[PDB]
């Protein structure tokens, strides 16, 4: 069904997105089990500790 | 008291969830099996251990 494949491409887009940037403004955080947020490539590069 | 309210609410929730799938199956349930005493015992223990004052699922 077209709405299922739309939702699945939307989920693929969300995962490829949160691989690069897990600090998106309008979307949920990608998380491990126990709920901690995943560190993305951007968070690896960004800050004083990056 | 703040912690224990939420933990007792979660316990009543789980007792309802357990018993409903028996009343949906037309037969009485043992409440000694419905009460999952881990909720209070580990909720208070966890929050005192870590100092995260809330649901362990919401630690951040």
């Amino acid at each position: 069904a077209a709405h299922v494949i739309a939702e699945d491409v939307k989920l693929l887009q969300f995962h490829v997105a949160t691989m690069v940037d897990n600090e998106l403004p309008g979307l949920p955080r990608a998380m491990q089990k126990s709920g901690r947020p995943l560190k993305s490539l951007k968070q690896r590069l960004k800050g004083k500790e990056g | 008291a703040f912690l224990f309210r939420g933990m007792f609410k979660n316990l009543l929730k789980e007792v309802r969830i357990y018993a409903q799938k028996f009343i949906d199956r037309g037969k009485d349930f043992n409440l000694e099996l419905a009460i999952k005493t881990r909720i209070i015992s580990d909720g208070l223990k966890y929050s005192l251990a870590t100092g995260n004052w809330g649901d362990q699922k919401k630690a951040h």
Binding site: - | F22, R25, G26, K27, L33, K36
Partner: protein, 621 residues
């Protein structure tokens, strides 16, 4: 040998013609729209096989698939080959479409490797003109297997493949325009999430056929997966099918189901049965006496007691905190069921047995061995069975679900000095058929030791006439397949089958699942009006030890009360009780399995009044 080569196929045609010239009358069976079966082939078929060929033609005209669901032994393969021969013979010119064959295009048959050469032999017997080639390491082809598929597509041969090659060669297979896909033993695609299932559904042809003796075995979901191969979209999507049929029909098999649930289930079963009926053709052996007859089967369930130490071990396990973690949802129930089912088989499988010592003299080395028969309540029964049957000169198949228990049984058979053969999934496939023929020929071998799942279909062990199923499986079709090693065409003797169970343990509940599942199957495939037996809460209470005193009924006898289910076999039972072996009770399995006006005055077809009557009767009580 098979026509993967070309000079073999040429030689096989030249030989067939040189034979045919020496025999140098019946008339073709005309159906309709053009289909003909050669008269010499149609005469060779039974009327039920003729009906199957006609049904296959009606499906070919509709361009629908079908499940040829006939019970094992009715000769499904002949019906398929006779139909395909008819298609090739009558040169059916496909209307209005790119498949401008004048005959049969490339066919793929997918089957277990154990039956590939049977298909080749049947084709080379019944319709020699075909070019049948096995895509397998047992196939005759010498070049790379990619080129065989091109050759068999180009010349419109018949490709025979394993399910594993379909799963692995998805592209090189599905690249081509196959005309027919036949799934033999097609219950192998019964899991909709399995990758063999997804690979089989990639075939573009509408002419998809399944051969299976069991369209369903556990769940209505298996039926969905087969119909989603056979007629995509006929049963809708799986989530919808589960909501509309699986839940309503299941929830009205319970004896504690409310009247509304019982009616809703009866309706849903009638709807499903009417939806699948055109596309599932299923004859039973009782429906057609033409294909011989079997001797009588006596199948009984023996309720054994736990030994006192086995009862302690089992009770301590159900009082354990592992079981508390299981019931509190911290653990999956699976490890606990595996443990309970071990304890029921032999406690040493759980406990490791009595503690090992070294330097003991040889006389101590019996009671202290791992798997000693006197610690298992079921082995004390098997001991008395084997002792009576060896004295009667019967021959025994001894099945267990587990191979660990099969080793404990082998150690017992050696210590009792019986002659036996053993087979299991570790027994090399090339050496299996030599063992089965040796057993059938050498009547000096008393026991064949066998896991239930080894060998697939086609293990013909009809040298035996007594069967013990040592422990129950969750899938009912496993234990019916087990007895059908002995009770099958070619059996000359009355087969007695004993199923061992331990009363008030997990084993009695596993048997209750088998019956519940078989009733669920019969409610769709036989008759939706059926009596309701099991309470749901009783069917899923798995971790409670009960064990009846000799004065008490089993739960099975309480459930099936009033059904009538409570000299060699009489003599065996007499000694199983009078010896005080620890048989609590016996039930008859076949008896348990008996679960049973201003308007409309003028026409412009079904009359409204009868369509309305059907709708009302379907929606009222």
């Amino acid at each position: 040998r098979d026509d993967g080569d070309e000079d073999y196929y040429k030689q096989r045609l030249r030989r067939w013609n040189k034979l045919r010239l020496q025999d140098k009358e019946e008339s073709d069976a005309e159906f309709d729209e053009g289909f003909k079966v050669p008269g010499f082939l149609f005469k060779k078929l039974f009327k039920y096989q003729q009906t199957g060929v006609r049904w296959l033609w009606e499906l070919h005209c509709q361009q629908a698939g079908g499940i040829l669901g006939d019970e094992m032994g009715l000769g499904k393969t002949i019906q398929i080959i006779a139909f395909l021969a008819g298609l090739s013979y009558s040169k059916i010119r496909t209307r209005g479409s790119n498949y401008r064959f004048e005959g049969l295009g490339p066919t793929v048959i997918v089957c277990p490797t154990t039956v590939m050469h049977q298909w080749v032999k049947e084709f080379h017997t019944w319709w020699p003109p075909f070019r049948v080639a096995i895509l397998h390491e047992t196939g005759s082809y010498t070049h790379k297997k990619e080129k065989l598929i091109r050759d068999v597509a180009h010349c419109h041969g018949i490709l025979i493949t394993s399910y594993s090659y379909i799963r692995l060669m998805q592209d090189d297979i599905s690249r081509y325009d196959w005309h027919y896909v036949i799934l033999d033993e097609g219950h192998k695609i019964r899991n909709p999430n399995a990758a063999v299932t997804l690979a089989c559904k990639q075939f573009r042809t509408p002419h998809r056929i399944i051969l299976s003796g069991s369209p369903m075995q556990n769940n209505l979901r298996e039926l969905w997966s087969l119909f989603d191969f056979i007629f995509p979209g006929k049963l809708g999507t799986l989530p919808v099918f589960m909501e509309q049929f699986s839940v309503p029909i299941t929830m009205g098999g319970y004896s504690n189901a409310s009247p509304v649930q019982v009616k809703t289930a009866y309706k849903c079963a009638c709807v499903l049965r009417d939806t699948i009926n055109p596309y599932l053709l299923r004859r039973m052996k009782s429906d057609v006496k033409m294909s011989l007859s079997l001797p009588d089967k006596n199948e009984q369930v023996l309720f054994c007691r736990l030994t006192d130490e086995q009862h302690k071990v089992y009770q301590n396990f159900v009082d354990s905190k592992e079981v508390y973690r299981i019931l509190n949802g911290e653990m999956q129930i699976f490890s606990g069921l595996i443990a309970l089912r071990k304890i029921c088989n032999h406690p040493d499988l759980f406990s490791g047995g009595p503690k090992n010592l070294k330097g003991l003299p040889d006389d101590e080395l019996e009671e202290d061995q791992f798997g000693y028969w006197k610690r298992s309540g079921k082995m004390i029964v098997v001991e008395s069975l084997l002792k009576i049957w060896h004295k009667q000169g019967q021959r025994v198949l001894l099945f267990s679900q587990s191979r660990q228990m099969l080793d404990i049984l082998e150690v017992f058979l050696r210590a009792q000095k019986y002659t036996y053969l053993k087979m299991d999934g570790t027994t090399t496939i090339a050496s299996r058929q030599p063992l089965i023929t040796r057993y059938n020929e050498d009547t000096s071998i008393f026991v064949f030791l066998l896991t239930t799942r080894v060998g697939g279909l086609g293990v013909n062990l009809t040298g035996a006439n007594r069967v013990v199923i040592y422990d129950p499986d969750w899938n009912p079709s496993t234990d019916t397949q087990a007895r059908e090693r002995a009770w099958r065409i070619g059996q000359k003797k009355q087969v007695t089958v004993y199923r061992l169970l331990t009363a008030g343990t997990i084993e009695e509940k596993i048997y209750h699942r088998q019956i519940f599942k078989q009733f669920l199957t019969n409610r769709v495939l036989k008759d939706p009006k059926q009596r309701r037996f099991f309470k749901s809460n009783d069917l899923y209470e798995l971790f409670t030890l009960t064990s009846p005193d000799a004065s008490q009924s089993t739960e099975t006898s309480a459930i099936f009360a009033g059904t009538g289910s409570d000299s060699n076999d009489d003599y065996v039972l007499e000694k199983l009780f009078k010896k005080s072996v620890g048989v609590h009770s016996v039930m008859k399995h076949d008896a348990i399995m008996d679960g049973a006006s201003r308007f409309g005055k003028k026409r412009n077809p079904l009359a409204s009044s009868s369509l309305l009557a059907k709708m009302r009767a379907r929606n009222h009580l």
